């Protein structure tokens, strides 16, 4: 069993440098690149007493590759794997795809090809990017379509960072988001999402970080993305494979947009005063304010859910916990899937970073919930797009790249068809 993880854009590599420091600390791998079958799925054996990750950090702008090369994790990462471009994407879906995209994909597509030949147990893929700009929308979408025609059958786990309703960083983000989702709807088997304002809510009420930064945001992202693959790295009472997220969560091949949320999140001084057992974390993960994406699940219905635990978590009590969740009539499951639960247990506990904001805990859970609650989020994203599309705002840049008004309307009606399906399936 093995897997490879690529990173795209500023959002990807800032997760990449932040998550791989956590992976090397779990397996006792020092930052200098050295210290049995637990680290094999992410790290290779480099001859004798040395390892290397199976990853590639690619970005068109060189601002982010040079600091990783001259950072503290210089010897851990391979220097040739750190790919750097020549020209910036400039928050344009077209520019990072066609002009700058076409001249660099030939290096990375052949690189990951030969990087798979030394591998033998490639279960799938998981990518890290953000459709809020150009590199994570244009270059990523070109990568997904050219990988699906080559491999196709293998899974792809998309982890994109979407914008909040009112809070945002860019101003032309819905154009990049609506254009790239036209290609991501059919080529992605599953795609987890994260919001930028909701994650601030996680650290505000619970962790009490009144002045957080993107470094603190990525550390709890590392807990999420490492928990889903914790079953493959270590043994457990009920192991779950990476392909389990395709069968048990995707009821239909185009409805593959689940939410995400994680618990417990607690500070140092609060960790010793709060009791930690499976009950409150099962009550807290379904809490609407503790979600990683701004969607009200009370308005919608859950299609599918999967619970994976870590640490000393016995199976007799967690089955009682979900039984209390089913009889709770606050939330409501859909009639098309009454047995909407997938339980998973792992003995390896959650680790902590030296000097990190998160405290140590004997157990944890990662809740990925499939629901129709993202339909109102997409309609709101489409609603704000119609105001700018009617005035032809920010259109002269994209048509100056080579595109035209055709795919603008194709992305609109395709997003309208996505809304037509989520209202039909929720009946």
């Amino acid at each position: 069993r093995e897997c490879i993880s690529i990173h795209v854009g500023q959002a990807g590599v800032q997760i990449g440098n932040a998550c791989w420091e956590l992976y090397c600390l779990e397996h006792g791998i020092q930052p200098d690149g050295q210290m049995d079958d637990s680290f094999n799925t992410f790290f290779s054996e480099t001859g004798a007493g040395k390892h290397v990750p199976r990853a590639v950090f690619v970005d068109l702008e060189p601002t982010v590759i040079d600091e990783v090369r001259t950072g503290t994790y210089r010897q851990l990462f391979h220097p040739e794997q750190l790919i750097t471009g020549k020209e910036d994407a400039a928050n344009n879906y077209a520019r990072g795809h066609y002009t700058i995209g076409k001249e660099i994909i030939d290096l990375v597509l052949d690189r990951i090809r030969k990087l798979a030949d030394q591998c033998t147990g490639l279960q799938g893929f998981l990518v890290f990017h953000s459709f809020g700009g150009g590199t994570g929308s244009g270059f990523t979408s070109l990568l997904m379509e050219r990988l699906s025609v080559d491999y196709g059958k293998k899974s792809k786990l998309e982890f994109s960072i979407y914008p909040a309703p009112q809070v945002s960083t860019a101003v032309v983000e819905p154009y990049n988001s609506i254009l790239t989702t036209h290609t991501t709807l059919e080529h992605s088997d599953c795609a987890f999402m994260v919001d930028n304002e909701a994650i601030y809510d996680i650290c505000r009420r619970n962790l009490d970080i009144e002045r957080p930064t993107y470094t603190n945001l990525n550390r709890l992202i590392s807990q999420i993305v490492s928990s889903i693959t914790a079953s493959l790295r270590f043994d457990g009472a009920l192991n779950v494979d990476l392909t389990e997220f395709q069968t048990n969560l995707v009821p239909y091949p185009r409805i593959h947009f689940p939410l995400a949320t994680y618990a417990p999140v607690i500070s140092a001084e609060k960790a010793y005063h709060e009791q930690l057992t499976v009950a409150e974390i099962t009550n807290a993960c379904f809490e609407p304010a503790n979600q990683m994406v701004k969607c009200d699940p009370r308005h919608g219905k859950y299609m599918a859910c999967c619970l994976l635990y870590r640490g000393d978590v016995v199976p007799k009590d967690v089955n009682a916990a979900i039984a209390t969740i089913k009889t709770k009539r606050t939330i409501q499951f859909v009639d098309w899937c009454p047995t909407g639960f997938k339980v998973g247990i792992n003995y390896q506990p959650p680790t902590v970073v030296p000097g990190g904001d998160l405290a140590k805990v004997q157990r944890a859970v990662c809740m990925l919930s499939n629901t129709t609650a993202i339909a109102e989020a997409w309609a709101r994203l489409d609603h704000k797009f119609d105001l700018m599309y009617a005035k032809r705002a920010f259109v002269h840049w994209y048509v100056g790249e080579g595109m035209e008004e055709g795919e603008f309307s194709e992305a609109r009606e395709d997003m309208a068809a996505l809304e037509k399906d989520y209202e039909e399936v929720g009946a």
Binding site: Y98, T99, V399, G400, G402, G406, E407, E410
Partner: protein, 325 residues
């Protein structure tokens, strides 16, 4: 005083690249004014079928404009459509064949034919010019030395071209010779969707000035006959290399035309003609004293459903526009 911009649709037969793929014929005609595509209406003035020959299109669309442009008013005939829609076949066509010749030879023939029927006192002075857009520069094809021309305004603040190769002509055969020189120097590239992919918006101008010796009344008329390119889908056509740079410039022209034609349909205040230089020379056509007649081109194949529907609503929003004639 005010006349609506007449819009007409022309579908073609399926090309060789479409029938072998297995594209279905979606074009459904309901009379001349209405056309239906996937069970929804699109109203125009006159919709031409695929069996309509070259001469039949000219008799219906650009027949009356020869009388309007010679009476004293201005007139413009330009087409909109994506790649392989049938624009160059409509305007240029094949000149050496009498049947396959397009509009702009038929326009020149009708102008000279009407002059021979008029009395001797009407003195005509026809002078032609021809240029295109390439690498964001106005290149004249009649003279290959100059590569960039500036757009200046006349006395009434109407924009027009300065420095163009203004050739004074006498006989109609000389005009056909310059049209042969125009097509020979035209930079036409090859791609997967159309072998004769014209990568430039070619403008043919005929400044027809006339004066009667008896009444001593002078009249002028600007006759722009434009052949526009089409927005090529890079996923369908595969525009890589230098042709991708050509896709930038031609799409800027029609997207700029999409801005002003939508600004005129909604009825904005500014009407941004200054977005691109192609909108400047087309400024008199859409908002001047010209009797403009757009002719939208569409393909009946199922492979191009999304772009063909965009071309019909491009014409519907053109229907609600009126010129200040």
């Amino acid at each position: 005083a005010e006349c609506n911009i007449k819009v007409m649709c022309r579908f073609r037969p399926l090309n060789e690249s479409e029938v072998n793929r297995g594209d279905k014929y979606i074009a459904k005609f309901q009379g001349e004014d209405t056309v239906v595509i996937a069970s929804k209406p699109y109203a125009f003035d006159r919709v031409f079928q695929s069996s309509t020959s070259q001469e039949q299109v000219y008799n219906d669309c650009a027949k009356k404009i020869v009388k309007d442009v010679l009476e004293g008013y201005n007139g413009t005939i330009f087409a909109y459509g994506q790649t392989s829609s049938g624009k160059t076949h409509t305007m240029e066509g094949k000149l050496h064949d009498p049947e396959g010749m397009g509009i702009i030879p038929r326009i020149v023939q009708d102008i000279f034919n009407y002059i021979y029927s008029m009395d001797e006192n009407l003195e005509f002075h026809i002078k032609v010019s021809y240029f295109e857009i390439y690498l964001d520069k106005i290149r004249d094809l009649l003279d290959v030395s100059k590569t960039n021309l500036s757009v200046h305004e006349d006395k009434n603040r109407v924009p027009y071209v300065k420095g163009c190769t203004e050739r004074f002509v006498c006989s109609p055969d000389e005009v056909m010779d310059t049209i042969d020189e125009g097509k020979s120097n035209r930079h036409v590239a090859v791609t997967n969707m159309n072998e004769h992919s014209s990568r430039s918006h070619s403008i043919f101008l005929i400044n027809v000035k006339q004066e009667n010796t008896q009444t001593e009344q002078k009249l002028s008329g600007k006759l722009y006959l434009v052949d526009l390119a089409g927005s090529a889908k890079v996923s369908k056509t595969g525009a890589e290399g230098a042709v991708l740079d050509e896709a930038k410039n031609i799409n800027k022209s029609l997207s700029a035309l999409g801005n002003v034609i939508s600004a005129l349909a909604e009825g904005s205040t500014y009407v941004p003609y200054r977005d691109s230089k192609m909108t400047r020379i087309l400024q008199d056509s859409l908002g001047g004293n010209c009797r403009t007649t757009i002719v939208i081109c569409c393909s009946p194949s199922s492979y191009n459903e999304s772009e063909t529907k965009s071309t019909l609503l491009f014409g519907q929003r053109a229907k609600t526009i009126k010129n200040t004639v």
